[PDB]
């Protein structure tokens, strides 16, 4: 789960996550929060584990 720029679309979010985390993603769901921030649920590919990716990111 990420907070993203409100102008970015699902394709841009997908490519941005793939580049700066070196992971493959399956799909991106997106909502805009009541406080105005865009939130993206980025499902990872089956061969990528979201647990240890969040560990190397530092948000575990």
């Amino acid at each position: 789960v990420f907070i993203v720029d409100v102008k970015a679309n699902k394709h841009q979010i997908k490519q941005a996550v793939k580049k700066l985390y070196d992971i493959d993603v399956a799909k991106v769901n997106t909502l805009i929060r009541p406080d105005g921030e865009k939130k993206a649920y980025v499902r990872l590919a089956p061969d990528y584990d979201a647990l240890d990716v969040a560990n190397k990111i530092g948000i575990i």
């Binding site: 805009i32 929060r33 009541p34 406080d35």
Partner: protein
Amino acid sequence: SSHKTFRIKRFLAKKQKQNRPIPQWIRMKTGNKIRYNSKRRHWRRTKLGL
């Protein structure tokens, strides 16, 4: 309503964000003179402009 435009939702977002109390450390600043947020808005008391 549930159905809203993006402009309306963004307007409501800013109104929500500024509807919070002042930080307590403001009251310790030099020459403060501010006691509390006088622009607090309750949803039932005062209705928004839109």
